[PDB]
Design a protein around this nucleic acid. Sequence first.
DNA 1: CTTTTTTTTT
DNA 2: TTTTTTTTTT
Lengths: 1171, 276, 86, 92
Amino acid sequence: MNVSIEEFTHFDFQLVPEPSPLDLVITESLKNHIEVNGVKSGALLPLPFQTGIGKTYTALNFLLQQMLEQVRSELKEKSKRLLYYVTDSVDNVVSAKADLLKLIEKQTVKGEPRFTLEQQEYLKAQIVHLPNQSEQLLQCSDAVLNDVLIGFNLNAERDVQAEWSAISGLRRHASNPEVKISLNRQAGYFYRNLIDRLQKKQKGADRVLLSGSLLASVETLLPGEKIRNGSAHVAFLTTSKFLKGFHNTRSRYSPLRDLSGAVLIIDEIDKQNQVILSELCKQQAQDLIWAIRTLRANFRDHQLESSPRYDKIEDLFEPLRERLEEFGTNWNLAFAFNTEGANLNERPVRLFSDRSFTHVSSATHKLSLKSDFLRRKNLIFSDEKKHGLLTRFVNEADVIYQWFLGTMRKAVFQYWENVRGLEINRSLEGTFQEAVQSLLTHFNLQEFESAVYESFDTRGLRQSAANKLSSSKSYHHTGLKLVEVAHNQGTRDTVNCKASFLNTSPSGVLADMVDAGAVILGISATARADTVIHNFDFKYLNERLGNKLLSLSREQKQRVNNYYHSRRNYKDNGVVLTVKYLNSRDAFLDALLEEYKPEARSSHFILNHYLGIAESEQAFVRSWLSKLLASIKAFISSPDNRYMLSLLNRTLDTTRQNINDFIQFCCDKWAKEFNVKTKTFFGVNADWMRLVGYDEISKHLNTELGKVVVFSTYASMGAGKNPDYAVNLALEGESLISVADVTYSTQLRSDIDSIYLEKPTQLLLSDDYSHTANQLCQFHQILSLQENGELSPKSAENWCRQQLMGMSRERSLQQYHQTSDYQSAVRKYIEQAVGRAGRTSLKRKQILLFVDSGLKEILAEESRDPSLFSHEYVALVNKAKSAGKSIVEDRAVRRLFNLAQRNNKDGMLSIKALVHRLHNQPASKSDIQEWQDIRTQLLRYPTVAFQPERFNRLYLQSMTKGYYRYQGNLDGDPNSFEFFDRVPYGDMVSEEDCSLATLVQNQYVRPWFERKGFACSWQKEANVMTPIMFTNIYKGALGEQAVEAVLTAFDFTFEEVPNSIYERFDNRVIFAGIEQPIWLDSKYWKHEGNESSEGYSSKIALVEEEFGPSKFIYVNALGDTSKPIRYLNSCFVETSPQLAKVIEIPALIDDSNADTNRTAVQELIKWLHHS
Amino acid sequence: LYYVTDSVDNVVSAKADLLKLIEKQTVKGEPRFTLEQQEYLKAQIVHLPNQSEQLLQCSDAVLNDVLIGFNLNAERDVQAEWSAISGLRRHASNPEVKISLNRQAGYFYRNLIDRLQKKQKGADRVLLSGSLLASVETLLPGEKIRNGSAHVAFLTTSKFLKGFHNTRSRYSPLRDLSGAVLIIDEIDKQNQVILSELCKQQAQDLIWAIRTLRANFRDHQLESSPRYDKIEDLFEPLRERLEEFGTNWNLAFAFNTEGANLNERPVRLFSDRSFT
Amino acid sequence: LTHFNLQEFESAVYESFDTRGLRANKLSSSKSYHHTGLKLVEVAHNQGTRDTVNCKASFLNTSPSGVLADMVDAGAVILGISATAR
Amino acid sequence: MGMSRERSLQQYHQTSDYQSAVRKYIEQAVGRAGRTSLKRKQILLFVDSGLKEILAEESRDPSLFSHEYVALVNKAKSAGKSIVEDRAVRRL
DNA sequence: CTTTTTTTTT
DNA sequence: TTTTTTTTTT
Ligand SMILES: Nc1ncnc2c1ncn2[C@@H]1O[C@H](COP(=O)(O)OP(=O)(O)OP(O)(O)=S)[C@@H](O)[C@H]1O
Ligand SMILES: [Mg+2]
């Protein structure tokens, strides 16, 4: 029945249901965001309220109001606004879709249904659900497939009909449960093939016309075709499906490329952190040697067409072409690569790079790389003792590869700009595939076609342009890299460098999603958990998004708290939560095992033989099983409780059926002991929940009389399930009591009445996809813990080194158990799991909570504001705290110590790399500007009031307000630095040792400092410079500026130093029309210059060779004015003034009274006249 | 020694006829071969069917022995695939199930042999003997040829042109034909079979291939080791030809058409390469 | 192929060896269709782009009789059994 | 240009290659009744009549044929001889 | 105007 | 020394 919008004309769009406080929480924040940041701006709104308060019901009412607003827009009149509902589990997707359909059906306004049957049918026609391809194929009938095959003329093909006949035959005898497996696999492969040929047919000139039955059948087979043609604009799907996209008749639609204006509702947003991570680690490794040799070979000559379509694109690739020419010249890319020597063949070389300051190599010795022109080979060898290291080559090749992928993204966007004007309503995603194909075909780089596509998929969300001390630096938009250097397959004389990259973290992906223009509603009670492993980094998201990260006011949070406490009034309704912490108590499991099999020798024999548990793992099974039994008995002993849920870490499916039999035996015994009927539901997982619905449990409690025990896990029943059941008053005595103060629900429902919470175990994420994926996931978690501040840079480097050498998973878990991130993840899991018993307002008078005693200390360490917790979590925390006493340790000061060490180490490594790039002549403009920007910034802002977002790595947060203490070798190990209170007799970073006030009392320095805008005082701001920037940059700029100011008053002219002699001397001096060039090397004060006459004489030799004879000035800005002015030759030997090429001045401004050394300047001027 | 014919039925009938000849051949009223001689001679003959048929005739004990002996059990999807295959085996219904079982048996056999070979080529080479050797020789009949246990093969022309598998790689019998004896039965019908294999070759984009050859032969060099002796002199004329062709035809640019009768239908050219 | 950076021809090299693991057009050599073959080239627009073409070429480098003669030249002794062998 | 399979088959039917292929298939198929030395006293062969003219043009040496194929040829040839062009002169 | 089945890997 | 399940394409 074709439903139009003509039946919504008489609909009254201004009559809306009563807005709850949660509805005003979403609406007021979104209307303020629109009225402030603009209509086209994206936003991220986390909603971290109590479990079971009504956040998903409010998100589905918000989705229904968006659908009604869109219908009104089409009535008044454009393309459809896309609404997505995303969560990590399939069960929550289908439950939310059925809840929205129930909302449309059963919503009544003032005693009458809101929507007529035709309005309901249209609204339901606007919602789609996008499952995996096996579920999409298996859920549509044989008539639909035969209609599609006939309409598209595909039964003529032989392979297609053979595969479809096999599918229909296998699915006919689908009663057996092992046919269902290997039917999903073939359904997915057939769906791939059929959609590939359907799209190939639909893209050519022989494009079929779709209407009537063929259209309805292809919209049934391809739900994304409904979205493509504008029939639907609401989609329900999982996070992994959202990250992979779906299919329409034309191509595969990626929602991440078309997020401008979309609305995303991400339920349990924190658990999506790991899901996105699991996708980022699935990327394919690339051979960097082949990739760079191919890029260099195909960029020598190939040219784009001179067409208006390719306007402005050829200028994007010119810098990459010059870079490739110089890289291939420097590293001799005409030859291939092989290793040389011993110990390089037993195990391949593995290299790990943070890409900023963490570099770990598996080689014992630093590996070099030399070119043998006689052998025509590049040899990776180990030396016996510059620009010949393997790490340098690998880092530059990774930079060039990422530069190529970034310039491909820029050229695709420029192509879309040119073709929009040439084609004069085609989207950036519509033309993306044509742009990539045309560019790669023109450059003969079609082998990168896959690499470019996945590049758009992940960090392709990055419309970027960076790893400079002038940008905002973070691990989350930088990533990591793991390179394996091993021999090629088959060959025994060449090696490859297989590199795996993470170009962004999940928090980077979310931030780029908000920057794309999406409005994202993050719904979870743990949306602001203080972990970076099991949640996003919200300190990074706050710093990056700014005011696009919408916040809720104190009044709104008070209204929500009043809303929650007015519907969950436990204290006034006589409801008691009884918490019990259970130990192993093995003296009871031994008796239970004895009564299970009286004929056996002892319980060790029963466990080893009857239950099938090995001797090594018996003790663990002895501890977790007995705790479970101690909870079951206490539930059975309770006369009034009916519903129990036991959340474990492992599924009790048929694989552990022997243990299930033991558990079933024990339950039957207790059923006999108390004369209560009990039913146990084993193996309640995702597959069970899709095959056998959870309503069966709800059916049992509705009809049968007795108790029910459910055995599920955290991974299946811990985040968003509503496990309530319909209440039959005849099956419940005087036990249920309503705890809300004004009834708010139709139908009587009650929730879980007893719960057993095991301690979550495998809290450090893993990846079973491959070995590379698990390596990337482990290095991502170490770098996230170092970037947040939970790990010292020394401990993070030691953990990255043990990870590169192949540490065991138990050692990793032991290292992660030592952080506070682990405790915040444990409390997050406990709070979410305990929130499954708080869904309804019909409560039992007593609710039994049985908790693993291994959680007792952890729950005792909870110290957040208790104004946001649920009642059960407050009961758990109060019980744990009242049980004993714990020593509370501070977490912000350890983070400040770690982040001071981190910032100092990053500044050290970046400064050394930048100076090394400066010393390699010629020096590019970018490096010169970067050096000047650092010196300018540190001169203008030695301290900053707020946390910087441009030079963040130049500053650290200090305990004190304008100074701090430190200890460390500034030319040694950056991992051995100490700060603040750990060193009470260390050095200082302040104004007192600067002598800045002493320096600026000079009559000529002060006007220069005032004109330039340089600070003459250190503002007492908590963000102060790092010791590296204090000593190697700031004081050098202070001395150079003071010397230049003093000399410029004496008619001295200064020029920029040529790029080939940069960083060698401060400035170039021209005075009194002297044709002899003068070179200036200015220092702040005397200190200690370790450069002996060797390095200085080498510098003089280099400058004299470049520019002939010249004079030199070795001047110190500050010092004693009574000291003599000395004359030295190029060999630093004292001689007569007339035969000395270098004159050294001890000082230019006095330090004891701040008086300019006029005599020394006069003598220098006179000697210059003599020169 | 190879026995080749077009049809599978003639292969199995000729193998059973040779085995019957070994069994009941007589010389002057007494059997020619004792039972142990007969068992040795029969052990020298193998039959190489398609991969789905090779896998579907291996019992569950043989395949679990192979998976255990190569540490292939704990490798995720492989066990997922194998668990599915054995399930389809147990409930083999009417041919509706059987077409699917054959397709998945062939795909699983290809994957399993690919990983067995990549394991045998690396430094973690498993030692094969006893039960493990007998099981892998049952799963891979060409492993018997590679070892030297057997030297008589019965197979079809399609299998002979495709080759078979051992633990190391895929053995192509056409590359090692020196000194072999081939018995091709119904040789005339093999004319069409070989033809149907020659037409299966994959098309090549000539513009991409020549632009790649020109880009990569410009500067890249072989090593100056003894193992590459006088190989670069084989490629020098091809490099000079490539540089001259690229200069003449302006291979720095890409190619496009223009005008009528060129867009509506693609252009097809046929060449005998001599005069047609 | 690794030394020349032409690993994208690896499949092409393997199949060519498959067809020609047993081994000119000059009026001075023996000429025949059975050792030279034929070629069919299709010139069409590249898939996805509207401004470049490709020349997809399919070759037959030998006939079945050329394959059989190459087999005998490689050193195989072949017994051809059929009533219609000639 | 894209001719139809029936137009290829029409063009191939005009060659003597087609007739040697037809007679090769017939002789091989008829050779399936000559496997043993225990024979029925009468053997019945029923051949499509649209084959008789083809079988009428056998000209090879009959010393290599089987008995059933010799009888098939003699029966088709019983209508006599039809004028045909020498294959060697046209091949020349 | 002519009028299909066959093997193998995928 | 710690002690798993989940989604999607292939
Ligand atoms: N008028 C109503 N207002 C609020 N909730 C309602 C209302 N009517 C029914 N509900 C149900 O109230 C229960 C509360 O569950 P949700 O609203 O799904 O929970 P939640 O607050 O989102 O907690 P999460 O998702 O587990 S962290 C659900 O069963 C809702 O479907
Ligand atoms: Mg929810």
